[PDB]
Design a protein around this nucleic acid. Structure first.
Lengths: 59, 59, 126
RNA sequence: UGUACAACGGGGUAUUGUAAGCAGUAGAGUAGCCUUGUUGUUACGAUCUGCUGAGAUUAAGCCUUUGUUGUCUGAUUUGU
RNA sequence: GAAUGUUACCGCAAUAGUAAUUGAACUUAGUACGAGAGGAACAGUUCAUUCGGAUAAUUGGUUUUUGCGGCUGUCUGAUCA
RNA sequence: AUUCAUAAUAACUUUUCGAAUCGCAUGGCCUUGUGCUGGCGAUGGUUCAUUCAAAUUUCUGCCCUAUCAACUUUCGAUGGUA
RNA sequence: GAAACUGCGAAUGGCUCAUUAAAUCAGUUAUCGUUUAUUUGAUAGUUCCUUUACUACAUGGUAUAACUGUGGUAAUUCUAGA
């Protein structure tokens, strides 16, 4: 059986990688695969305007 | 008592009140780290297997 | 009626059987019998006495309860909604690992834009 | 001459507190051997562990007993 | 414990003796009464005191169970016992 | 004044340090590759010296009392050796 | 630019004067008998370990907070799980 508050429902991870290689294998890409382009952004909406808040990369 | 439980897979977590002393004697005299089957405590938890992570007692 | 253990010896103490001893440190002890109690008055060691449960324990006799805490073998295999990922888009990006030629093309276009910018820099300086 | 009795035994139950013997890379340390050690070994060594809740005892006023072994016709006395 | 026919089993009761006693707590009741200060009673419940008669599950005591184990001294060649 | 400062061989070390850090700037050489080079700083790092100190420590000095004249040394009192 | 981590400081300062009579303390000395974060000045070409494939060196890996939401406590600058 599937329990609703736990099993049927699911939830997000609030964040993803901030590290180069973390990204790199979070998608299993390469030594070269433009991790910048494989970035995850978060979009929010201050007003009419929105923006993607791409964090950073370290190392 | 009550049971706060989590499903890492979905990543969810919910609390459940419980009575039936003779559902919870299943749990009685057990460690934090052991596993028990759930229809013993609620047929809603049939086939499921919980594990324990600790808790917070009276006082 | 409740059933207890011998503060010395480790036995179930059925009602009105055995005795109790108290100690001005508020502490309580129970005894099945005068034997254990007398050892107590003799301020003795229930871990050097043999026939106690405590000794059968601290010397590991009849220890048939605890077996092993197993260490599992399992992977993640739970692609979570990363909160900026769009799990369909997540699988799309996970499968788009090849075709680094698009990356190379963007990089050459950026080489061109950077050359143009440095040229504009030298010109604005001059 | 029998769900008879008895002694032995067996089991249970209760009490002690882990038997003698055998082993041990345990052992405070010590002397000796040479193959010298590459834990070198031989030997002295209270004690410690394992075989061991072990062995020992248990009715003499405890229970039981499908076992074993036997026992069961002596004496006297009494009458409306 | 002889004798009453024997012997056995069940049994009546002349008689004689006799034994239970005492207090507190709660309620009543801060009531009755009284100016007030103060301050009750029977019923009822729970416990106890003294005495008595029985028992000994458990607690405790007692141990020649010389049952178990332990210690010294000495004898058994040693050990074992 | 030193067995010193330092050096030097043999070895040792559960192996220490020897920069995966960051801002600002953007420059120069070209065989134009995101090629090679390059500055002003900020941090942190082994050791030596320094400095802010610290620890010990030398000599000399302190009130009333003898109705306290002997004291310390068991278990450190003194010294020596390891 | 909140919160948290990390780095630091929190041993200063301040107050008071109980104890303490060669003990603090003054003044004087030594550290050839030592510690020194720190400021300050100088200071690491050798370190790829069968160091000819072992290889990331345009640079390596794992946690974990803050946060998410789930909870206990009568209560504390309590806290757990996920």
């Amino acid at each position: 059986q599937e329990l609703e508050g736990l099993t049927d429902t699911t939830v997000p991870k609030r964040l993803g990688p901030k590290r180069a290689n973390n990204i790199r294998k979070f998608f299993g890409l390469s030594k070269e695969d433009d991790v910048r382009d494989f970035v995850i952004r978060r979009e929010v909406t201050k007003g009419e305007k929105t923006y993607t808040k791409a964090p950073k990369i370290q190392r | 008592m009550k049971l706060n439980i989590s499903y890492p897979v979905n990543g969810s977590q919910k609390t459940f009140e419980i009575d039936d002393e003779h559902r919870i004697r299943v749990f009685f005299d057990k460690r934090i780290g052991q596993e028990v089957d759930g229809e013993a405590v609620g047929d809603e938890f049939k086939g499921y297997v919980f594990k324990i992570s600790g808790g917070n007692d009276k006082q | 009626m409740k059933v207890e253990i011998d503060s010395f010896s480790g036995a179930k103490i059925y009602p009105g059987r055995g005795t109790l001893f108290v100690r001005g440190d508020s502490k309580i002890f129970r005894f099945q019998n005068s034997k254990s109690a007398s050892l107590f008055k003799q301020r003795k060691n229930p871990r050097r006495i043999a026939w106690t449960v405590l000794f059968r324990k601290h010397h590991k006799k009849g220890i048939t309860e605890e077996v092993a805490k197993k260490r599992s073998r399992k992977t993640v295999k739970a692609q979570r909604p990363i909160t900026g990922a769009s799990l369909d888009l997540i699988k799309e990006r996970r499968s788009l690992k090849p075709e680094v030629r698009k990356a190379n093309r963007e990089e050459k276009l950026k080489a061109n834009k950077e050359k143009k910018k440095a040229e504009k820099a030298a010109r604005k300086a001059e």
